[PDB]
Design a protein around this ligand. Structure first.
Ligand SMILES: Nc1cc(NC(=O)NC2CC2)ccc1C(=O)N[C@@H]1c2cccc(O)c2C[C@@H]1C(=O)O
Length: 167
């Protein structure tokens, strides 16, 4: 038993809810919140800019030190950093950005990072300003992640379409 509330159960291990992932993180304080990161950990917009804003830019300060030491991530890759005031840890995961021409097959590799954590609060990878089809992203999530994932979908219209179209 965990503290996530109001989710619809899609499979044995995947749950979904129309929710603002920022508000959901502040309320649950999960062990892991997933960020929709880019390879430079430049948290400008979408899910990343919102999570970073909620940390009063501390996420960006930590991220800049990470990149100065380690260099950029790979598309499909991840790193674990602090969750600041939102979670114990933030798993920064880089899904492919269709608006940069990146290979959508990298979406499965991106979701594989979630399997290193028993429970996660997450957005749909590559959705939103990353340009992929969120229905496809949800399908890859369900077919790739084996650990317990609580997906937060900001847009109510999309959530209903995601729910109403799910096989
Ligand atoms: N830019 C944001 C900002 C926040 N939250 C705040 O700003 N919270 C502050 C405290 C009030 C949450 C989500 C977002 C955000 O980009 N969503 C995206 C989106 C939108 C429409 C269609 C989509 O496919 C997607 C994929 C993303 C998602 O929903 O995962």
């Amino acid at each position: 038993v965990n503290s996530f509330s109001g989710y619809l159960k899609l499979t044995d291990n995947v749950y979904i809810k129309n929710a603002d992932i920022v508000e959901e993180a502040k309320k649950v304080k999960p062990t892991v919140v997933v960020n929709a990161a880019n390879v430079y950990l430049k948290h400008g917009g979408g899910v990343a800019g919102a999570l970073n804003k909620a940390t009063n830019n501390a996420m960006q300060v930590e991220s800049d030190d990470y990149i100065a030491t380690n260099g950029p991530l790979k598309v499909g890759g991840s790193c674990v950093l602090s969750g600041h005031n939102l979670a114990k840890h933030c798993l920064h995961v880089v899904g492919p950005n269709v608006n940069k021409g990146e290979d959508i097959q990298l979406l499965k590799s991106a979701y594989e990072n979630f399997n290193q954590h028993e429970v996660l609060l997450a957005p749909l990878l590559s959705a939103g300003i990353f340009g992929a089809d969120p229905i496809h992203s949800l399908r890859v999530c369900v077919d790739t992640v084996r650990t317990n994932v609580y997906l937060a979908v900001f847009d109510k219209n999309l959530y209903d379409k995601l729910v109403s179209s799910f096989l």
